[PDB]
Design an enzyme around this catalytic site. Structure first.
Site, mmCIF file in Angstrom:
data_model
loop_
_atom_site.group_PDB
_atom_site.id
_atom_site.type_symbol
_atom_site.label_atom_id
_atom_site.label_comp_id
_atom_site.label_asym_id
_atom_site.label_seq_id
_atom_site.Cartn_x
_atom_site.Cartn_y
_atom_site.Cartn_z
ATOM 1 N N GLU A 90 0.947 -1.114 0.000
ATOM 2 C CA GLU A 90 0.000 0.000 0.000
ATOM 3 C C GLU A 90 0.985 1.158 0.000
ATOM 4 O O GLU A 90 1.727 1.341 0.964
ATOM 5 C CB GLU A 90 -0.855 -0.008 1.269
ATOM 6 N N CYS A 108 -2.243 8.610 3.998
ATOM 7 C CA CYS A 108 -2.243 8.187 2.609
ATOM 8 C C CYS A 108 -3.575 8.550 1.967
ATOM 9 O O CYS A 108 -3.671 8.648 0.745
ATOM 10 C CB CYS A 108 -2.018 6.679 2.523
#
Lengths: 516, 516, 516
Positions: free
Chosen positions: C288, C322
């Site tokens: 990720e 993020c």
């Protein structure tokens, strides 16, 4: 489903002023009615008798809490005839109709919660929360069985089809049976044992325990107001084995549902196996016969959490529970830490009149008092008395929380059910030995383990041979639906109460095929 | 599922040349094998004894089909020890593993079908199709129970969750038990009674019926080849009550699975209710005890269809079935038409050595022959003999299809199980009276109704009190999975074979809670 | 299910006095322990090293919040050996047992909620609610994966049956792998990345981010008390790429679970694709890698609601997410109204020591401060600075909420992940152009749209190419179970955390057939 999903009735803790006020009012109402007389309930009506039974307050035995009629063989026969007459039509009621009747009864019981709790307090010596848990459990049985019964509705059996034929299998009730209830949970178990069989189409003759005939009568007031058809449920309080023996051995009694001592359970199971003159079926007998439950604690456990759970399990309702912790098995590393904590907690427990909500009320009767004191004398010859072991001052049957240490695993107090506030502590080398000692009794009802070691817990899950096992929590208070209740070995026939499987015990199956 | 959905094993009719060729070769090989000796099977090995048992050909009793070892108390104790030792590990096998073992056994049995059928023909006198149906049912039990057992796999119980806790309920097998099998379905019932308990983790000691010890041994050859671990299944052929009594009353026998006469079933149920010295559990006893099955025919029925179904039901395997039609209840309008048709059909039935594939072979033994003939003499003074009623010429135990009419409902031949080719015809006024007569016996296993009137059929569905009811077809030959088999009243404990519920009888439940 | 249905852990808002008091006590306890040293955790025991790592308070960098041991290649190898040794038996644990272990860990974490939150406040500069959301998410991962794992239990694969055969397909864990966690969600993501693989039978070596080694150690204190077997989970704090590189390239590392920068993610994915000398499998690498998330607002939106959501999304935890909104795409009609509201709200945001619960605490480290300030300088050459863009007074790494307007879609600050409190505003002609600009970046993690026009929302549902899209609400704070989290394109491999599919990534399938 046509009702909300099942949820357990909350147990009142009486932490609010309103709750305490409500209880005080209920206690006053109940004692103002100590002079009431409750007849038998047969064929939809209250029927009185010449002779009567007196119910006493275990916290003050000179005080009568009520009187009831006394059933004999004649009344038992009359109730049996009424039960079979009712069965003929009750068995044909749509299950939805029978379940709604139970739901009505639950609603009525819920509205009389405080009254029933107060009756338990005065009649059998339960403190406030023990009384509330009892009534809440009774409500749970009704709510649970009403829903579970629908799972067996016509035609519920899964079968393999065959060409050119209709093959239909379905369940039907057995008939009229007898319920022999205990005095320790005279609302909860009394109710469950009756409504379970009744929900699926059977009819019942219920014999309450002598020490709790008044609260049993109040439960029948609820059944009466709910509207069960005449004969479906019958109430037969009695003294001695007359009523129970007559029905258990009767050729026309279809099943027997019993909860009580092993001594009685063994006799009932033996009698049920015999074909009485003229009998036309094999009787079914379901018996729950107590236990000698242990809690194991190893060196990895949270000792304070363990001590608390042990004290609650051993002394709740004065240890008069089939699930009560009567044995404390400690591994060497946990012995001193846990024993010290258990003793410190136990010595702070209050004992006195149940209505004052003490940690412990009195044991239920003079006979129970005699038995517990007798086991205490036996204990002094087998183990080391380190706490209690004495009768406290007052006419009430008050016995102090008792603890024996250094008890041999095969000692009488480590093998026989005392059903009193007596805990036997056994020291063992390791967890393996703890399990061996835990399993080495004729019983197998409840058990517990306090440990942080996953391997020990999972090991116990597979090897601690009891029907109801609990990890890092008390071993009493099984909740309907959550923890199917019932044991192994001499603890009974494993008729799991508060579980879907319970109702199957009161049904037989028919398979009907039609070739077109 | 990891296998195809359950389907019943086709019953061979032997109409094709291939089937006939295969059967003739199988019969020849079995016959050429006459005299073979089969030992006991204990702890994974064949064990012989000094004494032996002889199995005769009922079609020619001078011929010895085979001999087997004879078990005594010592061998029974050895088998029990092996069974408990095996239980310790067998109970821990994943259910998927135990089920695959059963599936392997079914495949092995299927490949030995003709041999097993031929053995039934010679050892118990079944004609070809009766033999094929028997073996097919045995295969069905294995295939069905292998699949049904997976429905109980860990953790199978539906429970109500509780905050901050894991509540897991699951089933576990009981232990080592004894199976007492019948001689009339020595492959099918023998197999079902054993593999059902074993499938879910129990271990078994099986006692075959004296008249069918050879085929029982052949079934064990299959269990051995399949690979059941030592002690899981044990074979103990014996003479008299010695072996059975010893195990049934043993303190270490956990359960008893029995199929046979009511006389024996009553004794077993009574014994199972007693606590043998040192016993630490309440024994479970499942019994299937026969019946006095009736077929009702009213004036709206297809009389030809009814007559055919009655003849098949009454005389299949010489009426030696717990499901056999031994009573024919005819309403006034159906009496003459149906009785005339039944007599015409029954008088054309062939009787002779089973190997010749006659409509009727011999009854199973000299004692059975004596009993049936005795009942015929009794019937002559109760009703009117209108067909047969005598032994035929020949060494074999051949009895002619027999019919008594105008039989009183309470006559001995209308109430007691004869278990032979004897049909009692009862004339009643209407359908209501037919149902009354049908229900008025101590039994309740199978029953049938031939009628075109919907109201009569649905009335019977609700009031003809038998566990297996059939409309407009034969009342024998219940198929595994399709028709759960088991009765009411003195026909037994309603343990429905070939049904999901059957396996629950060999399991107990444990509830484990962990408070996090 | 044996536990209650999954529910998300409530996020504390601290609106009550009790909550605030509890937090203040936790903060005091945590700072009183700033001198603590936390060793590595290998093979079930805390193992210390010669060298150590120092963790600083980003709100006062001269203050040490704790020290930890420092792992090197030797310790990494030791942890790998321990992990494989443990895998051999951990993989065989019944799934129910492994899931219960996770549930225990969740209960332990829940009881230490305030302590962990306070540690996040002091170690990584999260304000009160950001800290509570982090810990609540960690608890959620444990509770969710414990339940989800049971959905894969033996044998879980749906297959087509075949005649005469048993065909069984099931899942098995991969082995020992490495987890490389981020510093921005050092409790939540650190926990999820570890317990997901572990729940289904894998073992893990976890490398915490340097800036959050202390809170990572506290999470391991929970794993230790829960009782994970030695070797199942290992803790290896370290400096630089030594530990991570050694494990990622190791021939005996089975899988790599990584959450962090794209730069590192690209290297890990490339390395995972190579066969190291002696390697016997194709490594699985889940990464990720952040995003450049935009919120689109058109002229039909509720401008006040949009402004609030934008400010929360852009500046929550100082934009160090993020999922943070780093781009604000406004259509012409929404430009002025929304920009004015965003600026008015943003200028009122407080910035200061995290423990005082300001809207914004400091960025995590001196290096992060350097990076954000560098991007601010780059921004002054690409867009128009209209708010903030400066370092605030104090040793703590305080940076003011920053806004650049008139930013070209392809500008560096409109394409590269700054991971700081910097928002780039882009004006577009219409919704179509808004989507084009939104999609034109190398990333695809989160995105949002504020609009009342149904056609625009549904259009975005089909064309705004991001893994997690939100309409009329903030684009941060994805909840476990509710919003499977993971992106497209260079945002990663789409390993959806908090979803059933996540666990499948750590399993392989076996198909076993037996022909009977």
């Amino acid at each position: 489903m046509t009702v909300e999903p099942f949820r357990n009735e909350p147990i009142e803790t009486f932490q609010t002023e309103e709750a305490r006020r409500a209880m005080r009012e209920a206690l006053r109402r109940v004692r103002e009615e100590f002079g009431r007389h409750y007849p038998l309930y047969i064929g939809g009506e209250w029927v009185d008798t010449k002779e009567r039974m007196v119910s006493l307050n275990p916290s003050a035995p000179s005080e009568v809490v009520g009187t009831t009629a006394k059933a004999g063989k004649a009344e038992a026969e009359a109730a049996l005839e009424a039960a079979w007459k009712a069965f003929k039509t009750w068995k044909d009621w749509p299950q939805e109709d029978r379940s709604r009747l139970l739901l009505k009864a639950a609603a009525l019981m819920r509205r009389r919660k405080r009254e029933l709790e107060a009756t338990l307090v005065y009649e059998v010596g339960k403190n406030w929360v023990e009384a509330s848990a009892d009534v809440a459990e009774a409500i749970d049985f009704i709510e649970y069985y009403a829903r579970a019964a629908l799972r067996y509705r016509y035609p519920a059996v899964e079968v393999v089809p065959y060409p050119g034929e209709d093959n239909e299998s379905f369940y039907v009730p057995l008939g009229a049976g007898v319920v022999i209830a205990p005095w320790n949970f005279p609302v909860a178990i009394f109710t469950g044992m009756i409504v379970g069989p009744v929900a699926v189409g059977n009819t019942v003759i219920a014999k309450p325990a002598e020490d709790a005939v008044v609260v049993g009568a109040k439960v029948f007031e609820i059944f009466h107001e709910a509207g069960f058809p005449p004969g479906v449920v019958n109430f037969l309080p009695g003294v001695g084995e007359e009523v129970g023996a007559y029905l258990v051995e009767h050729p026309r009694i279809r099943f027997i549902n019993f909860t009580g001592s092993l001594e009685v359970g063994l006799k009932i199971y033996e009698a049920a196996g015999r074909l009485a003159p003229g009998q036309t079926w094999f009787k079914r007998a379901y018996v729950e016969t107590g236990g000698k439950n242990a809690i194991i604690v190893d060196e990895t456990a949270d000792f304070d959490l363990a001590a608390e759970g042990v004290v609650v399990s051993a002394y709740g309702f004065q240890g008069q529970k089939c699930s009560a912790a009567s044995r404390l098995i400690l591994t060497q590393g946990a012995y001193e830490p846990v024993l010290e904590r258990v003793l410190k907690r136990a010595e702070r427990l209050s004992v006195g009149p149940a209505e004052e909500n003490p940690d412990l009320g009195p044991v239920v009767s003079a006979e129970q008092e005699r038995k517990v004191l007798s086991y205490i004398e036996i204990g002094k010859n087998e183990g080391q008395l380190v706490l209690g072991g004495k009768r406290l001052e007052g006419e009430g049957y008050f016995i102090a929380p008792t603890v024996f240490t250094e008890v041999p695993p095969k000692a009488r107090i480590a093998q026989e059910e005392i059903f009193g506030p007596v805990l036997s502590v056994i020291r063992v080398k390791d967890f393996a030995e703890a399990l061996e000692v835990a399993n080495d009794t004729p019983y197998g009802l409840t058990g517990g383990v306090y440990s942080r070691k996953r391997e020990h817990l999972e090991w116990a899950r597979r090897e601690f041979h009891v029907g109801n096992l609990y990890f890092n929590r008390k071993i009493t208070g099984a909740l309907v639906g959550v923890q199917p209740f019932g044991g192994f070995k001499l603890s009974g026939t494993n008729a799991k109460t508060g579980a879907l499987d319970y109702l199957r015990l009161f049904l037989e199956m028919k398979a009907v095929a039609e070739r077109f």
